[PDB]
Amino acid sequence: MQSDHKEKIAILVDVQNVYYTCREAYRSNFDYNQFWYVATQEKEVVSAKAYAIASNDPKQRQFHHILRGVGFEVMLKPYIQRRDGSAKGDWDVGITLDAIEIAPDVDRVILVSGDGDFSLLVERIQQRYNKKVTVYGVPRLTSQTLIDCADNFVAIDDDFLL
Amino acid sequence: MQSDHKEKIAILVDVQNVYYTCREAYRSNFDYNQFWYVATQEKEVVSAKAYAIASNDPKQRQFHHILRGVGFEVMLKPYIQRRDGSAKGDWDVGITLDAIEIAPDVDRVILVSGDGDFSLLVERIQQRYNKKVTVYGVPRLTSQTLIDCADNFVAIDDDFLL
């Protein structure tokens, strides 16, 4: 016999990617309340994490507070000393670690990022855990390889903008 | 009773990071034969992978052939379509996936990269699998956070240059 459990989901948001791609494509901000509302309809939310950058700025701290209110655990990037002049803002390693960890516990991973490097992560979730992956991304700035790897792709467009 | 098995190791080389950091610090190339020789002394090599960029250039193909001869499986980055103008060369997602996968099978992971974003990966290997991690990196271009996270740090300096 079958339990008829709601689809179990994990959500991982690449907050920096969402911010910059929405600014570049639309000069607008992402509506996290609309996203939560739609993505979680009829779903069991096993995990929901928003990967962001720590800030002493009151407006940024307020934004993080809003995200926690929506339902996310806000994951602030640990300090990482830099000697090579490379970009300080990237959460790819930590998102990769967490997405693989949560895959066995969910039916579907929802990744909110247009970064094509995550194609390898989508593929690995499908190969090892045979779970579904949905990607939300700004279409004009999302890798086609990532769109094609995902089981489903949902556009970040006006339906998800403030 | 105890088996006295040699220490089991996995090696993961971030070939692009090694290349650029050795060029910037030393205007020299890494000696992969010297590295293999030293790193594998008295070790059981369970896995050894060199993460590189595919090329149609005969000199690059020859370099990959040399690496395979040294003992590496050469992992060439899959094509990833890009719409956002971001850097095409980064292997962080794939190195993260593979390093976590191999951790349960080895006593020590050897990561050849100075990229501080791998600090989160080192920490996760230690927390979840309680294995050792050695980092090899060009000191003047390696994140201090990565050096401090690693169980051992070995400098890529003249002892490992061609």
From TrEMBL, chains A, B:
One of its GO terms (molecular function) is RNA nuclease activity. It comes from the Bacteria. Transmembrane segments: none annotated. Gene3D superfamilies: 5'-nuclease (3.40.50.1010). Residues 8-156 form the NYN domain. This is NYN domain-containing protein. It comes from Vibrio parahaemolyticus.
